UniProtKB/Swiss-Prot annotation, chain A:
Keyword list, A-Z: Aminotransferase, Cytoplasm, Glutamine amidotransferase, Repeat, Transferase
Induction, as annotated: Post-transcriptionally regulated by the GlmY/GlmZ sRNA regulatory cascade. The sRNA GlmZ, together with Hfq, directly activates glmS mRNA translation through base-pairing. A second sRNA, GlmY, positively regulates glmS indirectly, by sequestering the adapter protein RapZ and protecting GlmZ from RNA cleavage.
EC nos: 2.6.1.16
Name of protein: Glutamine--fructose-6-phosphate aminotransferase [isomerizing]
Location in or out of the cell: Cytoplasm
Keyword Zinc (UniProt): no
GO cellular component: cytosol
Domain SIS span(s) in chain numbering: 43-183, 215-356
The protein's role, per its UniProt record: Catalyzes the first step in hexosamine metabolism, converting fructose-6P into glucosamine-6P using glutamine as a nitrogen source.
GO molecular function: carbohydrate derivative binding; glutamine-fructose-6-phosphate transaminase (isomerizing) activity
Gene name as annotated: glmS
Top-level enzyme category: transferase
Organism of provenance: Escherichia coli (strain K12)
Reactions this protein catalyses: D-fructose 6-phosphate + L-glutamine = D-glucosamine 6-phosphate + L-glutamate
Shown stretch of the complete protein: 244 to 600 of 609
Length: 357, 354
């Protein structure tokens, strides 16, 4: 691994997400449909039994699992639950009928997640599927099925392309399951259409990078931050805050935007930066109401908003205008500006963004 | 008005023994839970249940998330808990024979009522409201309803609302376990715990001046971290919510097994870390998480069972709790955290009363 033109490996890994996602899609999209034949000819038999999906993960992989739950329920109609592995492995849980256990890990050796999989064997799940970046790892070996993310090696201190490539795999599995259930073929068609557009969409907003870098300067004297999102963007806010905290040591936390009135609002003042992801969807007007709560309360707003969402930059509201994006890939797309934000704030504070050597 | 008490919040904390006893009134008979007030159609409905969906926000959400551990562990019933503002606007997968439970103090919370109304549209099996206000919209519009009998709260925050909601939820866990034919020892142990809970809280209140003294450590603090595992994780969440709501400290809660993604690097000597440590199967795991914090220099306030085996040191301050029946431990361990938040608020000069 050489940095090329990039100044840091984390920078390289964020900017290379278009190529990373195309690597994730290779051989898995054929004639406008999802092709998961790598799973073998025994997969469909199992997968079409599935009536429930249990996801186990931690950290950034838990956040990606949380996004996919919205997809599985809304697009594939399959009940889905996501749990932190360290809590699942020690608690007596209820049996869901015909449940598929999905594990998300980048290394495939994450102890609590692997411990959770080794417990699922004894509780009678239908089967297990590992979504992982390392072939031959324990989670892959010990799972019934496995789908590699093809993200390559990360040298940044936190995962960037590893998160978006997991989401990409999860979204392909949504499309495959939607077909296995006999749902309308248009669902798979629209998912595949969005995934095919996502690399170019990410390339489009990377042009906004130096805007994010300048706005990051506002974080120079701060050590708190608040991230807001709604719907399938709430886990993107959670991931944004995790990134900022892991890489910059800012006390960053995330809330579902419709819940500000339970604590956060009282602490919001002129010294609190509030970061919001605002796609142009059915939740936008409600989100604007939540954004106004923060604005009228003095918060310093940094809003990553679709370019036709109608926001106006004022003194305490800074708008980063995002290109249009297909709604099904919007959570993957809106993660990228938050990665850039954490990267730039980390460097401003003088913190390392790359692993030693 | 306050009687012997200083602030309404102090009164409401010190009275939760009474409050819990009021919540149990008429609902324990011959060692079993008696929810015949639900009406004669309740048992068919509840006997059908294969899944429980809980909708709430705020404090009632945290109570819902405690109950999820009970419904799954003790009744064997899959349970999901969701913030109402998120549920009402997403296209969700309806589980078979799903029971919608709403939790609300007022019975009028808009998003929660919207979620109930959507559940009818989506073909849920039925609905049950847990609430403190008879005749409210959530009560009238649900198939079944159980009042908490908590009374009125004047404190800026919710003290007896949370513990009395939990008490109702646990009685419902017991009822469901009998309906489903699970071992009668589950209901017996729940009933035994609930009967002992007011006395246990009274025993704990003797620690109030220890807690008051330790709260002086927070006078110059603006951050705090709350840790819990298992069914105490939502107790940590509620404790952090309290401290933030009434003391304006930036308080956060984490599952203690997850220090590894963020919290541990932010922990220093100026970071107070509050932990609830019941004597159960997770205790040895929790102690290792505590040791990770201690090694980071974090300064620990551990509310711990007297039989847990904790020794106070310079950086570890133990508040000894009585022995607590495990089924009511989440209810029990909330109260010292309420007292902590109360005393920190007073030391900060905040009002604790509306
Ligand atoms: Zn982890
Ligand atoms: Zn609310
Ligand atoms: Zn601070």
């Amino acid at each position: 691994g050489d940095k090329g033109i990039y100044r840091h490996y984390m920078q390289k890994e964020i900017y290379e997400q278009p190529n990373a996602i195309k690597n994730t899609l290779t051989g898995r999209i054929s004639h406008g449909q999802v092709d998961l034949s790598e799973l073998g000819p025994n997969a469909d038999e199992l997968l079409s039994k599935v009536e429930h999906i249990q996801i186990l993960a931690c950290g950034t992989s838990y956040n990606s699992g949380m996004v996919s739950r919205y997809w599985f329920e809304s697009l594939a109609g399959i009940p889905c639950d996501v749990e932190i592995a360290s809590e699942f492995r020690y608690r007596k849980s209820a049996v869901r009928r015909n449940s598929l256990m999905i594990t998300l890990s980048q290394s495939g050796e994450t102890a609590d997640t692997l411990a959770g999989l080794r417990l699922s064997k004894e509780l009678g799940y239908l089967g297990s599927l590992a979504i992982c970046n390392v072939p031959g790892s324990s989670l892959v070996r010990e799972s019934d099925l496995a789908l590699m993310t093809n993200a390559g090696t990360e040298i940044g201190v936190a995962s960037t392309k590893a998160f978006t490539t997991q989401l990409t795999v999860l979204l392909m599995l949504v499309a495959k399951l939607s077909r296995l259930k006999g749902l309308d073929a248009s669902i798979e068609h629209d998912i595949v259409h969005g995934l095919q557009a996502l690399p170019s969409r990410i390339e489009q907003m990377l042009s906004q990078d130096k805007r994010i870098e300048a706005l990051a300067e506002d974080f120079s004297d701060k050590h708190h931050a608040l991230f807001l999102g709604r719907g399938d963007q709430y886990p993107i806010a959670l991931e944004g805050a995790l990134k900022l905290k892991e890489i910059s040591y800012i006390h960053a936390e995330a809330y579902a935007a419709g819940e500000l009135k339970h604590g956060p609002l009282a602490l919001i003042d002129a010294d609190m930066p509030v970061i919001v992801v605002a796609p142009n969807n059915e939740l936008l007007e409600k989100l604007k109401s939540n954004i106004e709560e923060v604005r009228a309360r003095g918060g310093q707003l940094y809003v990553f908003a679709d370019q036709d969402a109608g926001f106006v930059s004022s003194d305490n509201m800074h708008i980063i205008e995002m290109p249009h994006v297909e709604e099904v890939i919007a959570p993957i797309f809106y993660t990228v500006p938050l990665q850039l934000l954490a990267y730039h704030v980390a460097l401003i504070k003088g913190t390392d963004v790359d692993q030693p050597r």
